[model samples]
Target: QTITSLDPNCVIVFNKTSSANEKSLNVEFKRLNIHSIIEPGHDLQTSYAFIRIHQDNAKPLFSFLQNLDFIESIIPYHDTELSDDLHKLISISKSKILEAPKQYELYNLSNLTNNPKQSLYFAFLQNYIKWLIPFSFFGLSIRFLSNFTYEFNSTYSLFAILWTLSFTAFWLYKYEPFWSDRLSKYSSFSTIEFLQDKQKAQKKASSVIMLKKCCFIPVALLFGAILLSFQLYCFALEIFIKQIYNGPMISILSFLPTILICTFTPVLTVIYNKYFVEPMTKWENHSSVVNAKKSKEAKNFVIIFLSSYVPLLITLFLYLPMGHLLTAEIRTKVLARLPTHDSDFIIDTKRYEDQFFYFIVINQLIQFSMENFVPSLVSIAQQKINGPNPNFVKAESEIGKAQLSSSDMKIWSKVKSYQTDPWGATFDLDANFKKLLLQFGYLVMFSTIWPLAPFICLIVNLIVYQVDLRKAVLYSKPEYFPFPIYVGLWNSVLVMFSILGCVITATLTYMYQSCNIPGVGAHNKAWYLANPINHSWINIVLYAVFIEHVSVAIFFLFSSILKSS
Candidate 1:
């Protein structure tokens, strides 16, 4: 169930399928290197150490050993001793949970969070080793997928949708203080004087934290007037930008509203998140130290997701298919206001695909740059301003500096490492996960419009993967997160997106009237020519209902089979 700690430099997990050739692969590790402590896999499945020394000679061996066909996982090891050393170096002698007024620690399901199986499973999700699979599969499964949507053609039979369904079924039924209320057993420890005092505090703070949206009607009159005016102003701004710069390459002007909305909304989201949400989270007087973090991440996921996803949603769902139909009266009334010719007061509403392109690719790309870039810029600038710690330089390189004991030397370098990058002590792992979730949701919803969107994902993920790994290696505070048994509610929202993804596929292919099929005519309702006829809502309803059912049925069927087996 678990690999014993060899204190090896790193551990390698064998490819399950290539287990046959593993011994042949094992023979290669003991090359001309002076020392190679290649322990055979404990269960003949786990190989410990690529052996840190002799790396110059190991280059070809390392490259060959790292080849994709054989290795399933390989990761550097960090045991308890180093972590204790880091804790002392950072002066974090005690945690806030340890220092709390009264703590009722939940032990019911907490062991699952720390168990060996969970550690290995969570490691697989986080490791560099898994990247090769998707990278290889991208070529295996597709590109030019949109060009060939139907099966009668050569590729893209919407098999990707079916693939997502399988993952959805797997994670669909599967964390946290969230489950702590009903089941977790809490240990007894407290004070009566603090108990009632904390009680009144909790009640007052609870209502106060829930205060913002309650008096909504009172503030709505004032805020709504202000909000209503700015929206019209944005409307006029759009018209002016469009009219002034009517023709630009790729219709950059048309895409501005979406970009503008997306940019401002996220700006305000962080503003409120930092400014109000967290202030209230603490004000709510959560009894547990961890709840504050959970509550904050709880608020953060929704804030970022709603803000990041809404514009993209409208671009696809609201504006693209049903634009201008509902705004019939606007052009005439607006012509008078703008003081332009009737033709000049045009209501241009057709370019949602441009918005789609921006959200699915450019918008996410900018955030990736901002996420990884800003920190390095700060690190670079800080180096110029404050300069390096003299102790750090001495501790890092022992050649020319005054001699110190090896103990203080390790301590000094470790201290300087986290000190120089204050953020290294506390990287917001969940916040990073939020932006990642944003990319995934966008990919799920918008991938239908462009075949290339996943490639956009494929590339961004490949790069983002490196920065995340780089942070894990050097930038992040080690062990900032508890050992997560699962990705927590992260996987919860993933299945939600896939269901929507299925819906998108089902409805989009409900009838590709413009679809070209080699054997069938356009008169056949594209894919779903199987639908019953009429102009009533039932026609579209039937299409969606039937498509959705088939999609759900596939997962349900697969789920039944797996469980039965």
Candidate 2:
């Protein structure tokens, strides 16, 4: 090892660091370089000194030199008088290092090359939304078709298909750059660096179009085909339900396939979520589409999703007793008020209107909560989570010609990527995802459990209420985003619940599952007279609506409190 010589005339020092104390040498040498270098030498050596640095590099030369770990000291000497040009150059270098953000300047270059927590979710959401678009249109189209008979005069299919094409076309046209079509017909992106010249938001949104070609086209088309086929199944089911005499029976039968599908939905969703969905999400973050690195995380996510479903599915199937009770009253009503096929069927557009209005109102409320409350709460939670939480202090400084301060541009040459969160902490994202699956999963699962499940759910929800806050505050990082604005998943989930509820009600009422079950004591003539299936279904709908509304309210309140903090 070379020896470090301590000398007054030496203008630089580069210490070899072995322990934590050695790292402090940078700051120490910096002060010495500026304030303590009284005399100067022209040479710097490993043991003594030999190299001479101009006055221009005196300060940053110290910083740049500190980056090295071999030299003991460097000395510089000036004749009794300093040159005017040399002093000016020295001042410029001083401004550069001093002006930069300490944290930003100190970042290791290697870290930037391998940044963690890349914001690929923005890309994923963009791609996912486009893929969902065609499927949604098909579903709507099938729904319209299912309601109408196959007559040439029927406008349902005609309008639905036209509307689908037109709406998508309009959105695409509106989003595209105005100048995109003005380009020379023969020219490609190589002509103008068309991609880079575009605004960041526009580029982000458009990049997904390429991604859609690679992954979405086939999946979306196939999904649309499947949904359209399912629409036919639903059409048949709807016809059967409308034939039921009583509201109770109709309600029960309308919600068909409760037991059978419920058994599979969670399992399938889990499988898709873990393997296909989660890995896709992870890979998007980990790899660049610009690069060739492919993600192999698919199998792991798939396994996790599949294994998780076994317990969930079995538990759901075990709750067939609850499904039985829910439909009991409707069965009784069906027996009491059996009607002929020729009976007039009235379409209650008013009920549909009211439900639609309620949906809109609920959606707006959720939107408000997500955007306003959630972010605030996350910030509050982050403060609690990270000990000795630092308060934000925003300020600006100006360096004028006369002031001659350090150069702002030169000071902050780079920054660490992991420290970024324009919205919130890293943990907040994870926590939000976790709460969504567990809470929503429980709600959907409870729909099939015993009448007592609501009460049990109530208990679980309450526990979740506390636990979620603890996770948000104690474990999650500080960040915020407007979450609740027409949250698609929540609305989709509600719509699904409504459809499932209708089907379950219809099936039980038609089959008389409750009355047939030997041990339920549902066979008593007095109990049978009350139309158990219809009565129970009305209660189920009411309970469901109540539970849903309460959960939304609680979540809103939780967010509000968190934000207030």
Candidate 3:
């Protein structure tokens, strides 16, 4: 809660080493003929000073403030400080635009009901897009995609194949304009360009220094690589050990593999992000706070997402396609090399569905509980012990009482001292946005394999959004997204995934034969089962080329026909 509802002129003063800190600063401040409020720091030496300079003296103090003794530096106390009418946004934080006001504008001002239309990003585009488009966020689309895939897969192989290609293409068509459509007012939390535009910050930081942040990207990549490989190792360990140790206690101990995965895997990510990611993000020579947050979102998402989606992708792309043949060889070859087996073991034919269920359903439950349930319980526990915003309430009452006796100026001194606290907890918009985007990625990428992915996520999202709203009502505040004209870097990311899905899904559908019992499709199972080895392995390439190109051609036509809806 950096904002802390502090006045627009707020600045946190730091490190007035001398004992006469506030007193020393006050003497100098008055000499400038300023309208200001000086508040004591927790130590009463370091302090907060809110100052509004006169127009004639509108410029900042060059030598007096900056070139000072007994001082470290003054940091800007930043938050979404809107004018009086927009005060309501402060309470909800910047999570969602309020529907009641209907005063908030869309990315496209004239696209919907015209003036200040009330719709979230989800409802705004979801109800409108085509693809049998009855949508809520991604759930509806995924459900629809799933409905088509399973129906077609069961009916005929070609149908599933075409749906795979066409679905991705059509969504690609929708996503472009959807991205452009939302960009209109999609701003982030930033004041660098704002201040630079206003001449308040007349100069920009060096691009050379900014590019040094490029070095930081790989550190995150390195972390992701480590996490991904470890997840694969765990998966392999479970698969292999289950085969070797088929003793009586095998039933009870088998689940230890997933347990080990669940616990040991995510632990490092939390530590890495908290200890390293946050600090490095802030360390960048950021032009704006918004830029800093965006970089952090991208880097952090990559690391965390690797932990979540790596196993799913590997299962779908690598193992599901040819694992059984390899495992069949293993059952014959590797198992006998190990300890004597007590029972028979064969290739697990139903791995695709099983993996999806565990990941999509089980993982969603785990993630939801940790993100929402654990936090809410913590809030409740804190309340049970110390009871209700002690610092904030006490500070508010103390300030109100103190100001009643004398009315001089406004101040926010000692705001976050143990006896005081900020107005609200910081609700990281990027973190939540990254989470939602991951769910969206799941829908776009692999919902076909498991039709229920969207439904589970949709249900999860309902609770997710409700929790956000509830907390907004409680005491969480941050401008995760400041109003923007476009979604900025995130649009590029969405485009990357939506387009990539066409290729991946096409590949998935192409290679799968008898996927639902070696007869997921009549012609499909027969054709794919005919053996690529006999066909010289060229048909896979043919399917890849024809499917992708045909889908892209459809996207081109749709792109031309569909204007900015």
Candidate 4:
């Protein structure tokens, strides 16, 4: 059967014969009225026909014919979305949309991206610039302070060091609540809630009152701070004095309790503010306020040593061995040159980056773990802290399957569940501390190295986060709430680290002064400056002066900028 033409006015031109073979007269003349062609005889079984033309003419003809409904389909322009700008961009950059390569311009793709580099480098820059800025301003301040303090025969260096630590400590503590906005994101401990709640506020006030009445705790704190400062003084002073020993006292004093003061003095202040000052400021102690009895007194003293001195003891012990190893390394490097003075183990400055990094990482893990786990773990393990006050989770109303009873019973039941012995037996402190230490060891191992260092804590946290959830699920106690103390600790530690880094690096670099010697040119000036004594003291003085000025500036600047109200 033959079908009617789609356009009867236009001819249905048959083109079984090739256009090449056909005469120019036949192609031009016969095709003038053509609408659509049906080649029924050419391939009886096939449904499609091919219409071919050169690239130049096909576009206009296709356009004109496309306007007519008689035309079923026309092959489009050869370019696909391949011509779209986005597609072209993807092709040139060889990236998928939104999943581009880190190397390429836009995407924040995997390891190759500038994100990590920028973040790490920016951190480096912030550090370099901040430390640099302090010294720039500090030089003038030091001169002023030195001139003022000169008449009293007060050691400006010693005064400035103490002043800086206190200044840094106060600034750290005062500004901490503001800095703690980040905490709400990670843990449930709410600094905001703690500060805002009326009961907590009253409790804080009472604690402050109690604190004032006792007087002993603040004295204890001040003593601890002084001790800590002394310990640090020893570390800095001993190291500095070792370069030029005035006698046996100098050598022994370097290892003395100066560091104990330096490290733990501020530490005591922190603890006081946490447990005593804040609590007193908020809460009125209607309960009996009494001093320690004999057993309690002994326990309190032991507690002080355990809380304040134990870390120092461990630190001093570690440094003793570390100092020896460092000295041996120095001796080997210097071709067994006889040293004129007592020395720290580390001799080279540049290498301190890795070493100091490891040092901080180790301490950070230890501190972080101990801070997070210790108190809370102790409470869970003991199961009976002054007998249970059961409103630990719920106050009175029964919620789920939990039995309603005395607050003590509910609290005890909850604590029992969180305890390692879920069977409600007495918890083991020794085993718990061991587990915590092992966890800390894992954190140190992961974070100690530069690579994947972030993951060390993060991976442990992944497990910890889940473990905490599981503990919450399996346990019945009021969720163990962190007191949100670590921000202060971390800030203190961070400042300590910054100051420590500068000192350690400067000391090492200065000690190996000859090594800083450039080959030959201006050799006289270079050699003179390279004198270990000159290099060492200059570095020390510069750092000391820098710290004083910057610290003073920071104090004044903040004072002027942010009002207490």
Best by the lDDT measure: 3
Candidate 1 residue 515 C-alpha distance from true site, Å: 9.0
User: What lDDT tens digits, residue by residue, belong to model 3 across residues 38-103?
Assistant: 554544345555554322443344234433433333322333333222334433334443222122
lDDT for every model?
Answer: 0.45, 0.32, 0.49, 0.35
lDDT of 2 by residue, 417-530 (tens): 112333323333232333333333332332222222223333333333334333322222322111110022323333333333333323322323243332321234234223
For model 4, residues 1-565, the per-residue Cα lDDT tens digits are 1112121111112233343543224334433543333322212121122232333343344344333223222221111121243234334433332221222322211111112212222222222223323332343444455443221121323333333344344445443343233323334321112222223233335556455546655655665555555555555554544543446566575555445655565676567556755455334343222221221232233234434333433332233223434444453453224334544333222222344344435644665566457767776756566334332433222223234235323332333233323322222222223333333322222121122222333333334333332232222122112222222222333354334423332332233223332321011443322232334445656765675466556555554555452
Q: Write the residue-wise lDDT of candidate 1 on 1-565 in tens digits.
A: 1122222233334433355565534644545553434433323233333333222543454345444335543333334454444334223212331221111221211221222222222232233123323522452355433234421121222555665666555433322222333222322111111112332334445555457434333433443344334444554456556643434443666567656655665575566567666666666666554456766666555545555555545444433333333234454434324333333222233344466678877787788777767777877887787676222343234422324345433433443344345545434545665666667667655555554665666666655644553454344433311221114556566666766666665554443323332222123333222212222345656766776777778877876765554
Poorly placed runs, candidate 3 (over 4 Å)? 1-19, 23-225, 259-289, 326-345, 376-423, 469-474, 478-486, 516-538, 545-565
Arranged by lDDT, best first: 3, 1, 4, 2
**2 or 4, greater by TM-score:** 4
Pairs that collide in candidate 1 are none
> What's the lDDT of the predicted structure labeled candidate 3?
0.49
In model 4, how large is the Cα lDDT of residue 324?
34
Cα lDDT for residue 495, model 2?
34
- Candidate 4 ranges with C-alpha deviation above 4 Å: 1-415, 419-476, 479-534, 551-565
Q: What's the distance in Å from true for residue 246, model 1? A: 6.6
The reply for model 2, stretches above 4 Å from the true place, is 1-202, 205-449, 480-486, 509-514, 524-565
Model 4 TM-score, all chains together = 0.29
